[PDB]
Amino acid sequence: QSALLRTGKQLFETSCVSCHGANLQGVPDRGPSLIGTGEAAVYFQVSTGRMPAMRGEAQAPSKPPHFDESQIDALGAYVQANGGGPTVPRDDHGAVAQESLIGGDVARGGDLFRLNCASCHNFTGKGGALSSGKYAPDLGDANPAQIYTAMLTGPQNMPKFSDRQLTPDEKRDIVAYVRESAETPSYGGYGLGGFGPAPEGMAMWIIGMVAAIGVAMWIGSRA
Amino acid sequence: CSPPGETASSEPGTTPAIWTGSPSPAAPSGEDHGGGHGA
Amino acid sequence: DFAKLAAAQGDAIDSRYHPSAAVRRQLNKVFPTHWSFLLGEIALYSFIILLLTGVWLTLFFDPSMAHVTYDGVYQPLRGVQMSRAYETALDISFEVRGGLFVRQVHHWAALMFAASIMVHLARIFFTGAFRRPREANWVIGSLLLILAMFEGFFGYSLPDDLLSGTGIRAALSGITMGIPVIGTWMHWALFGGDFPGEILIPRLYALHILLIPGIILALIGAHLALVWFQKHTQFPGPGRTETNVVGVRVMPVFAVKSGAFFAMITGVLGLMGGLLTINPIWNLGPYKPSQVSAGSQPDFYMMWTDGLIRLWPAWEFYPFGHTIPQGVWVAVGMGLVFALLIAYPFIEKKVTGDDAHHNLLQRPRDVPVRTAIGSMAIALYLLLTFACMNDIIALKFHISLNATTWIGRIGMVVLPAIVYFVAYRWAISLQRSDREVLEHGVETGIIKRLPHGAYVELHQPLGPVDEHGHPIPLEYAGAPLPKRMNKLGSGGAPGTGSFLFPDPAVEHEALTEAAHASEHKSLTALKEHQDRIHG
Amino acid sequence: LVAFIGGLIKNPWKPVVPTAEGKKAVLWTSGWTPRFKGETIYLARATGRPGES
Numbered sequence: 001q002s003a004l005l006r007t008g009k010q011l012f013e014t015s016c017v018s019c020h021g022a023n024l025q026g027v028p029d030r031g032p033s034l035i036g037t038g039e040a041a042v043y044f045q046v047s048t049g050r051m052p053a054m055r056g057e058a059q060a061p062s063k064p065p066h067f068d069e070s071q072i073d074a075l076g077a078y079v080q081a082n083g084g085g086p087t088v089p090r091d092d093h094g095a096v097a098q099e100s101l102i103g104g105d106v107a108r109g110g111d112l113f114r115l116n117c118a119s120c121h122n123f124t125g126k127g128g129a130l131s132s133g134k135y136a137p138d139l140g141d142a143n144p145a146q147i148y149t150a151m152l153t154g155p156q157n158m159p160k161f162s163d164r165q166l167t168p169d170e171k172r173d174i175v176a177y178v179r180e181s182a183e184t185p186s187y188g189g190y191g192l193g194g195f196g197p198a199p200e201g202m203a204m205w206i207i208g209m210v211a212a213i214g215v216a217m218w219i220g221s222r223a
Numbered sequence: 224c225s226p227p228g229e230t231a232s233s234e235p236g237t238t239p240a241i242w243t244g245s246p247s248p249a250a251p252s253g254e255d256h257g258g259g260h261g262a
Numbered sequence: 263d264f265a266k267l268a269a270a271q272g273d274a275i276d277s278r279y280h281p282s283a284a285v286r287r288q289l290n291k292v293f294p295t296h297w298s299f300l301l302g303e304i305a306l307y308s309f310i311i312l313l314l315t316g317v318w319l320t321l322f323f324d325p326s327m328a329h330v331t332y333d334g335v336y337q338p339l340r341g342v343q344m345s346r347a348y349e350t351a352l353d354i355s356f357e358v359r360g361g362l363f364v365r366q367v368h369h370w371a372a373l374m375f376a377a378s379i380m381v382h383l384a385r386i387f388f389t390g391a392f393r394r395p396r397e398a399n400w401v402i403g404s405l406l407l408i409l410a411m412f413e414g415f416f417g418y419s420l421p422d423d424l425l426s427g428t429g430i431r432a433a434l435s436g437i438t439m440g441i442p443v444i445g446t447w448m449h450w451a452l453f454g455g456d457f458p459g460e461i462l463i464p465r466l467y468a469l470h471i472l473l474i475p476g477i478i479l480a481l482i483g484a485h486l487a488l489v490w491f492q493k494h495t496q497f498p499g500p501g502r503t504e505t506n507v508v509g510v511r512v513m514p515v516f517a518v519k520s521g522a523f524f525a526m527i528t529g530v531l532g533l534m535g536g537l538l539t540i541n542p543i544w545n546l547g548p549y550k551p552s553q554v555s556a557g558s559q560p561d562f563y564m565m566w567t568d569g570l571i572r573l574w575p576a577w578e579f580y581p582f583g584h585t586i587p588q589g590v591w592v593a594v595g596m597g598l599v600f601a602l603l604i605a606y607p608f609i610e611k612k613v614t615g616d617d618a619h620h621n622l623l624q625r626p627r628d629v630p631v632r633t634a635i636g637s638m639a640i641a642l643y644l645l646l647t648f649a650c651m652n653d654i655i656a657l658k659f660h661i662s663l664n665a666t667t668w669i670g671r672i673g674m675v676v677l678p679a680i681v682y683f684v685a686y687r688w689a690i691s692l693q694r695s696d697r698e699v700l701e702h703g704v705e706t707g708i709i710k711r712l713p714h715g716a717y718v719e720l721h722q723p724l725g726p727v728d729e730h731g732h733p734i735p736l737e738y739a740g741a742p743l744p745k746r747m748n749k750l751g752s753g754g755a756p757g758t759g760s761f762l763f764p765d766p767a768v769e770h771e772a773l774t775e776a777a778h779a780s781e782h783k784s785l786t787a788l789k790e791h792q793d794r795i796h797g
Numbered sequence: 798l799v800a801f802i803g804g805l806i807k808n809p810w811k812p813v814v815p816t817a818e819g820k821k822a823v824l825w826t827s828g829w830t831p832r833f834k835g836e837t838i839y840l841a842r843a844t845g846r847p848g849e850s
């Protein structure tokens with residue numbers, strides 16, 4: 001719909017053209033180019049909230065979303081009409097598909113998440129550190145369509161795991177893993193983060209060892 | 224110390240010529256004759 | 263038939279053997295009741311847990327590297343190639359009834375073990391429990407710490423979950439190859455092949471059930487024998503001279519509180535083995551050498567090691583056709599610190615001149631440079647650890663990762679100097695804070711002077727007083743002097759009744775008069791013993 | 798003592814793996830090395846499928 005493209009243009013003019021130049025270009029050393037990134041890229045970068053941003057820093061972090069689903073389709077179709085690239089997967093309603101993306105396998109998703117990317121984040125999808133200030137974020141507060149469009153067009157410092165690098169079966173399979181690894185409870189106690197031994201150490205000292213020394217000073221006297 | 228085998232930018236390489244891969248003398252313990260049958 | 267049979271079996275035991283001499287020598291042995299003298303017992307009392315869980319973990323764990331598809335119950339690992347160590351560790355986690363709990367309380371007992379060893383080393387360091395008579399006890403305890411650290415590292419690497427498989431790749435195979443002359447040789451002797459050499463995990467299982475815990479049990483046996491026969495040390499106090507141990511005897515009191523403290527250490531380990539996840543190897547993967555985490559951090563008692571890898575600033579050497587890599591340095595460095603941690607009592611026996619048989623402890627404020635060298639070592643450990651979770655610190659506490667490893671890389675050079683300055687002068691000011699509680703009294707609320715306007719703090723003296731506003735100033739004796747009249751007998755008589763309802767007043771009078779007379783009898787007997795020592 | 802240790806001491810520089818030059822040791826040899834001459838060593842990904850291709 002052309003009125004939807006116009007709505008995307010009206011939201012485009014009054015949020016970003018200080019850093020995208022209003023011809024969908026890149027304002028040099030203030031905000032990069034934007035054509036070719038596409039509706040999938042704009043869905044992940046505004047549906048998470050990140051790109052209607054406020055400073056150019058180590059990496060632009062997560063935030064509350066600056067537009068809603070009635071307007072992300074407008075903004076992403078506007079950037080795809082000006083440019084053109086990956087598109088967000090949509091179900092039989094025309095809306096953004098978020099539940100039909102969980103694939104039928106998890107163990108293949110476990111091995112593929114673990115090989116291809118869990119170097120950067122974590123095993124269950126907690127965050128991980130990156131080089132100069134930038135960091136991987138947690139995958140717990142991640143809409144499955146945002147996970148698919150996160151790996152589909154890689155925003156900041158992550159490789160864009162393309163439609164041909166990972167097949168959509170594999171990408172549905174990875175988002176089946178992470179929406180049932182950051183959602184399944186920690187089997188057998190409190191989950192001290194997701195990454196193991198450093199929270200287990202710090203919760204050995206102040207929970208276990210401080211209680212042990214407190215028992216040891218209640219039992220023995222002092223002199 | 225810095226390792227000795229680094230840091231030499233010549234003209235940045237010819238593009239690698241298409242891999243005309245040689246056949247395999249790992250399989251070669253076998254000679255394909257006319258065939259095997261009864262007759 | 264309950265006391266008569268006890269007498270009959272006791273006369274039978276005294277008939278067969280002749281034990282009662284060398285039993286009365288045992289259950290009249292006195293251990294002092296200072297609280298810190300229980301700390302090393304935690305390192306004992308969790309270690310027995312490490313057997314009582316660990317034996318249970320031996321008869322379900324199958325070490326191998328034969329690559330099996332899972333085909334079990336855990337759904338995110340099905341049809342995936344895994345070593346059979348990881349497969350039967352998954353079977354300990356999910357098949358057997360109460361299996362995840364026993365392996366978790368086993369890992370938490372390992373953490374309380376290798377942490378209480380460090381707490382107890384802090385005790386016997388800063389209290390000075392390592393000079394002349396007990397320096398071999400320090401040496402075998404230090405070796406026991408080394409074996410604890412290496413054996414726990416063999417422990418959580420024993421399933422090859424890849425969070426610890428990359429720990430074997432970093433520590434046990436990058437540093438082992440990175441040793442100059444005989445490095446590759448001891449690597450290929452330790453593994454029998456490449457890094458996933460098929461006889462690594464069973465060799466760690468062999469070293470980790472018996473071969474290192476046999477040496478650990480032998481050193482704990484000889485260690486508690488050195489603590490037992492050679493008498494325990496004590497802080498100096500009222501009736502505490504150099505050649506006696508005051509405290510409670512073994513049989514009525516110390517056995518009860520020692521067994522109860524074993525039970526409460528087991529209670530803390532059980533509560534935190536149930537309520538807190540540890541090493542979730544199903545969330546982790548099977549070790550495949552092409553996939554990592556982001557954390558990739560070891561267990562905390564060894565986080566000072568590869569944190570020292572994370573902070574040593576990439577200094578490699580290249581001799582004539584060879585290579586010394588970075589990993590030589592920490593292979594020197596772990597060989598450095600241990601050679602300072604084993605051989606410390608001989609070091610300060612050379613430096614100070616302590617050629618005397620010391621049995622009384624020294625309070626850690628009374629020895630400021632040794633407490634300050636110790637706090638250098640404590641804060642250097644805390645730095646090398648707190649820049650080994652470098653990754654997840656820079657993750658959560660939003661810092662540049664390069665910035666926090668530079669913070670560590672400068673911190674290991676300047677923060678021991680800062681903490682040496684603060685520790686030395688803080689020990690001296692803790693001395694001066696309880697060397698003015700003798701020249702003055704103990705501080706309380708303020709009275710004004712009557713005819714003029716003054717404000718005196720109304721000090722309460724500890725020793726004999728003179729005829730005027732100052733007492734006879736006592737001498738120091740290595741004791742913790744009380745700095746609150748609170749901790750003296752002041753206002754310490756609440757209602758004895760209940761938490762809700764009072765007891766009748768004659769019962770309150772009887773209880774507080776009897777408890778006051780018993781405390782008076784305690785200090786009277788201890789004071790007359792102190793006068794019997796000198797008089 | 799050498800009967801204890803002699804079962805452990807392997808030579809890392811015994812030529813084990815077949816290579817295009819001949820038999821090289823294991824540290825100078827990944828699986829990226831050619832076995833006889835220029836052979837097609839495909840840079841294949843690992844689609845993490847349980848077993849089939």
Ligand SMILES: CC(C)=CCC/C(C)=C/CC/C(C)=C\CC/C(C)=C/CC/C(C)=C/CC/C(C)=C/CC/C(C)=C\CC/C(C)=C/CC/C(C)=C/CC1=C(C)C(=O)c2ccccc2C1=O
Pocket residue numbers: 198201202205206209210213380381383384387388562563566599602603606635636637639640642643644647
């Ligand atoms: C006592 C001292 C070590 C002197 C020894 C002599 C010295 C000269 C030998 C050379 C050592 C020097 C050269 C290098 C340092 C390397 C270091 C010592 C490695 C050896 C291992 C071992 C001996 C470490 C030291 C002992 C250890 C730090 C004592 C614990 C600290 C104190 C005194 C115990 C009470 C603390 C208890 C009440 C809990 C309080 C809570 C605080 C926040 C715990 C701090 C803390 C710790 C300590 C962690 O290990 C940790 C690990 C992972 C996550 C978090 C934490 C964490 O928060």
Ligand SMILES: CCCCCCCCCCCCCCCC(=O)O[C@H](COC(=O)CCCCCCC[C@@H](C)CCCCCCCCC)COP(=O)(O)O[C@H]1[C@H](O)[C@H](O)[C@H](O)[C@@H](O)[C@@H]1O
Pocket residue numbers: 125126138139140182183184185186189190191192193194202203206207536537538
């Ligand atoms: C009594 C009867 C017996 C009942 C059993 C009791 C034992 C507890 C286990 C029972 C199941 C509960 C575990 C839940 C399952 C679980 O794992 O717990 C998560 C961890 O989350 C959090 O931290 C938030 C929790 C905050 C609560 C307070 C924190 C605990 C403190 C006290 C721990 C102390 C540690 C030492 C401090 C160090 C001192 C420093 C000076 C919380 O899950 P959730 O909040 O919903 O979502 C996750 C996202 O947190 C997560 O970022 C996301 O990534 C996903 O994981 C998502 O699932």
Ligand SMILES: CCCCCCCCCCCCCCCC(=O)O[C@H](COC(=O)CCCCCCC[C@@H](C)CCCCCCCCC)COP(=O)(O)O[C@H]1[C@H](O)[C@H](O)[C@H](O)[C@@H](O)[C@@H]1O
Pocket residue numbers: 131132133641644645648662663664665666668669670672673676677680
């Ligand atoms: C429990 C409380 C603990 C409190 C500790 C508080 C910490 C003290 C002060 C720390 C100051 C940190 C300033 C760091 C700010 C920063 O980011 O600088 C970076 C690197 O700086 C640095 O780390 C140097 C600073 C080092 C600090 C000195 C250490 C002091 C010791 C004493 C503190 C240790 C405390 C440890 C506590 C452990 C417990 C002990 C009991 C530059 O690298 P980077 O950002 O990655 O690269 C750049 C591109 O990003 C950028 O675009 C481009 O423009 C270029 O600039 C490029 O280079």
Ligand SMILES: CCCCCCCCCCCCCCCC(=O)O[C@H](COC(=O)CCCCCCC[C@@H](C)CCCCCCCCC)COP(=O)(O)O[C@H]1[C@H](O)[C@H](O)[C@H](O)[C@@H](O)[C@@H]1O
Pocket residue numbers: 444447448451452798799802803804805806807808809811
């Ligand atoms: C704990 C005490 C530590 C004392 C260490 C010093 C004592 C060394 C005594 C050993 C002397 C040599 C014993 C016989 C060995 C020999 O003949 O040496 C041949 C070629 O080496 C050589 O000349 C070089 C010999 C120089 C020794 C270098 C290694 C020294 C130390 C530092 C290595 C660490 C070992 C202990 C740590 C490991 C910890 C384990 C928990 C191997 O050619 P290879 O072709 O691989 O033959 C294989 C059969 O050996 C092999 O058993 C058989 O398994 C087959 O694999 C076969 O291939």
Ligand code: HEM
Pocket residue numbers: 309312313315316317319320323351354365368369371372375376410413414417418419420421470471472475478540541
């Ligand atoms: C000396 C003190 C010991 C320490 C510090 C220690 C430490 C550890 C640690 C940290 C683990 C990993 C647990 C996990 O995360 O799953 C482990 C596993 C294991 N422990 Fe020990 N251990 C000790 C003694 C023992 C003993 C004496 C035995 C047996 C008699 C034993 C049997 C086992 C077995 C079979 C495993 C592997 C099974 C598994 O990890 O699931 N351990 N140990």
